[model samples]
Each structure stands twice: as structure tokens, then as C-alpha cells.
Target chain A: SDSNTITSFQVDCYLWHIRKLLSMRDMCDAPFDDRLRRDQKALKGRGSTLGLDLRVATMEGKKIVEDILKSE
Target chain B: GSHMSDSNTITSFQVDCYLWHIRKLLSMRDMCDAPFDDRLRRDQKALKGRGSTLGLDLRVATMEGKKIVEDILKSET
Candidate 1:
């Protein structure tokens, strides 16, 4: 039960951090658009090595994030 | 070392890893376009217009992606 709780906590932390990061990015004046593009390219390159379909993951992830944000 | 291999079933850790990458990718995607923030704020405002609270239950929300990851694994079969 403890392990399960820990996992859940970790997931929450991950999600919260992501939301905070997005909020910070939005509030910024510059937003570093070029750096974001470069990061996406690098993430995809690394993701390919793991045989992961990042496009699909990104879509699913967006759904999850949006669901959480919209949830009451 | 990554726990994932060319296996048929995906583990919870693998799902976590997928979510981790997804977070990174999504954050970048959101930041790349300036219009996205405007849209996001508008959506949130609409939510308030409906008299809905902004409370979030992260525990329940985290489970939302589990089925998605499993579905992806099944599709790979």
C-alpha cells in the first residue's frame, strides 16, 4: 500500500510540476520559442532510441493534461 | 538503465516514462506558440463562466493515462 501511495504521489508531483512549468512559460514575455523547438527535436531524437512513438504519447499526454485542468 | 524492452506488455514504469516524456514535450509545445496561452486562458475563463470550481484532484487525474498507455501497448501487439 505504501508503494502504491508513493507512486501516486510521484505522479501527482509530476503533473503539478508540468502545470507550473507551463504557467511560467505562458507568463513570460519572450517564452523562448526557438529553445522550445530545439528541445522538441532533441526529445524526439532521444525518444526514437527507446522505440517510443512520441507523437502518440504527446497526444495522449495532452488529453490527460486537459482532462485534469478541466476537472472539478 | 531503462526497464523497457521489445516486450508485448508494457509495465507501469514504462507508462511513467511515457508520461514523463509527454510532460516535457507538451510543455515545449505549449511554450512554442504565443497564441496558445491566450487560448488556454480563454478556456479557463469559460470554465469559470459555467460556475465550475477550479479544484484539481491529482491522484484521480494521474490514473487517467493508465488505460491510454495500455491501449497503446495493445495496439503494438
Candidate 2:
């Protein structure tokens, strides 16, 4: 039971990159001078759509996570 | 809240009106987008992730949206 009018569209954004951050954080356990640069680069193509996938980021702590997401 | 008035409210809901084309909002997924969701699950090793991820079935996706939306919009005189 399908109508002809372009029946559907799809949306596929990602959050796989988180583990990379986790690894870096766990290993370095430092201020991570590259954190800001890294997150900004990752967020380059991401727009409002990608933003929907993220939580307030409780696991990662609000301040650093917000800073990471540039939520402010 | 744009069509809140009782008179103008004669018109029902609109589909395109509800969609948010935001890129940052892209993580949004539905049962329809499960194909993409499954893909994400596979890659991230996150199995329990639910529907609406990105790889929708391509089956009920559009119809589902159009159905509720058009039916609602039909309220208009």
C-alpha cells in the first residue's frame, strides 16, 4: 500500500566520535590543550539537525560538555 | 501557537510546518530512519538504540508523517 508521491526521506547523523574523545580523556587525564580545537573541528559540518542527538551530556559533566558542544 | 485562534483554527495541521531542517539537530531519528540508526548502532557498538536514528525503513516514513499531518490539516473549512 504505497502512494507515488516521494514516499520517504532519511536522516543519519552520528555520535561515534565520542569514543575517540573518551579514549583521549582517559589516557591523557590532562587539561587536553587540543580539546577545544578538536571539538570545534568535529562540529564543523554539524548544524541544528546533528545537535538534536546530543544530551546535556551528563556522563561528561555539564561545563566541559557544554564547552565542547559550545552550548553557551 | 500561530494558528491558536478558534476561527483560523478551522484549518488543520500542516506537515512541512512541523519539520525542523536544522543540521545541529541532525541526531534526531525515528523508526522510519532506523536503517541509519542501525548503521549507527553497528558503528558505535550501541545495540539497544531505538528507532528514528537515520536509516528509516523508507516504507512508512513519509506516509506516517503525511497521515497525521494531513488529517489534522483537514480541519480547515
Candidate 3:
């Protein structure tokens, strides 16, 4: 893809293959930004701060997969 | 036994404070040689606005400040 977007996931039978966005984010230098930064901060405030919080979810989850197949 | 807010971890605060202190030290202390105003100006423009604020400028400012602190600390040693 010209934009490098990934569209395949089911190849490994994982309906939702998960990967942390943080690795690329952290390594990408100053220009790197995720608009969800403020949102990430808010969620960190709510979570254990070092543990799982849905805000950090790699994928939107099962509902998204089920719903997206139904979207247009 | 941990009563403090985990959000405010001690080691975390140490690093954060050090970073913050570095910026403050740089902004005021000045190298007094060539001075870094030109670099600051360029960084400010690159940020497009956010870097003008002390709180937000810390990111770009931290880079230069960290370098300065490292150099000074190295000199002391």
C-alpha cells in the first residue's frame, strides 16, 4: 500500500492481532505524535498507571471487528 | 505500606524533576558564551505555538537542557 496501512490480520486466525503503538511512538523522534496523547494521559490517571487500561488497547476490540464487517 | 499516590512514584518524580530542573536551569542560567536564543527561536517556530509555553516547551527544551547538564556534569567530574 502506498500509505503503508495494514489491512490483513486473519492470516494468523487472530481476528484482532494486537501490537502496542508505543514502540513506534517512543522511537520516532520529536515529530512523532498521537492525537490521543491527552486521552492516554487521562486513562493513565484512571488505571494502576502501570497496568492494563482499555485506553491502551491495541485494537478497538471484538465489537469493532463484528461491527466493522457490518459497516458499508 | 505504600500510601503515596502511585501516580507520583518517587523515582518517576526524580527523573521528571531532573528534566524540569534542567530546563529551568538552562533558560535562566544561560551558557553566557554564544547564548542559545537562536536555537530556542528555531525550536519555538518548529513547535508552531505549543513550545512557547514553559510547560509545553519542556520537550524541545529538555533536549538542549539535557545536553548542557551532561556537559556541565562531565566537566565537574
Candidate 4:
């Protein structure tokens, strides 16, 4: 009955992927189209369970995760 | 001075650190209205252990972590 609930590990994996994607955006100077394409494919496949997509998830999710890291 | 090459790698330890902070703050928010002393103490002890594993200072992380959670909750509600 609890199949819909997301686990802590799921959250961790999502955050990890998001962090790596964002970091690539920050460190790279070019448009990084390849990375974006890959991220879109990867995140779109996984976002259904987390209730978001690649664009909104990356934007909002990036802010939340960054806030947590900034505290360190 | 030359510019160093950039690496966009994120370590597992870093992911654990961020998750630990998020979970700790979320737990505190959930426990705010409850009167469960034992659970509170247990959670605090467990969180402390987790912070130690990540080499984080909970006191410092809690400062900013609280604000992050508050912003998230406000956005939701």
C-alpha cells in the first residue's frame, strides 16, 4: 500500500544527479548542449516519481540543494 | 598563472552531507508540534552521529538549514 512513497535513498540519488548536472553547468563555459541533452533524458526518465521534470526540477531543486550545501 | 581544468564530479560523501542536513531539518519541522520526548532525544542522537560521519558541525549547518526548510515550507503552503 505504501508503494507510492519515495524512500530516502531515492531522494539522495535524485539530489546527486541534480548536483552533478548543475555543477557541470557552472564549471563549463560553453553552452554544454551535450550535457543538457543527457541530463534532460536522464532526469525526465526519473522525475515522474519525484513529481517534477527536468526544467522546474533543475531550477527549484538546484536552489534547495545549493542552500543546503552553502550552509557547509 | 594558468587556469586549471574543471571537473564536474560530485562525491558520495557530498551527497550524504546534503541529504543529512535536509533530513535533519525536515525531521525537526515534523517534530515541532509533537510532545514525544523519547523520539526527540533519539532523533537528535542519531542526527549527531550522522553529522559526525559527514564531518559536519551540526550547530553551524542547523543555522542555515533551518532557513532553507522554512523557505521550502512557506513555498509549499
Best by DockQ: 4
Mark the 10 consecutive residues where model 2 chain B has the least summed lDDT.
B8-17
Q: How far is candidate 1 from the true structure (C-alpha RMSD, Å)?
A: 18.1
Off by over 4 Å in 2: A1-14, A27-72, B1-32, B39-77
Query: First chain of model 1: TM-score?
Result: 0.44
Cα lDDT, model 2, residue A6: 9
For model 2 chain A, give the 10-residue run with minimal summed lDDT.
A3-12
Best-fitting candidate, scored by TM-score: 4
Off by over 4 Å in 3: A1-26, A30-72, B1-24, B49-77
Ranking by TM-score: 4, 1, 3, 2
* Per-model CA lDDT versus the true structure: 0.39, 0.28, 0.32, 0.45
TM-score head-to-head 2 vs 3, winner = 3
How well does chain B match by TM-score in each candidate? Answer: 0.29, 0.26, 0.30, 0.50
Q: Which regions of candidate 4 fall more than 4 Å away from where they truly are?
A: A1-14, A21-46, A49-51, A64-72, B1-11, B31-77
| Interface C-alpha root-mean-square deviation of candidate 3 | 21.6
Candidate 4 residue lDDT tens string, B1-77: 54423332213223333445555543444422222334345646765775576566666656544554444435442
Clashing pairs in 3: none
The residue-by-residue lDDT of candidate 3 on A1-72, one tens digit each, is 211011111111111121112223232222223423443454445334324444333233333333433442
Docking class of 3: incorrect
Can you give the lDDT of residue A15 in candidate 1?
40
Better of 1 and 4 by lDDT: 4
Superior candidate under lDDT, 3 versus 4? 4
Could you give candidate 3's per-residue lDDT for residues B9-75 as a string of tens digits?
Answer: 2222222333344223333443212223443455445443433322333454445544543443344
Q: List, residue by residue over A1-72, the lDDT tens digit for candidate 4.
A: 122122322333344454444444353223333544564565556567457554554455446445544665
Which RMSD values do the candidates have, in order?
Answer: 18.1, 20.1, 19.6, 11.2
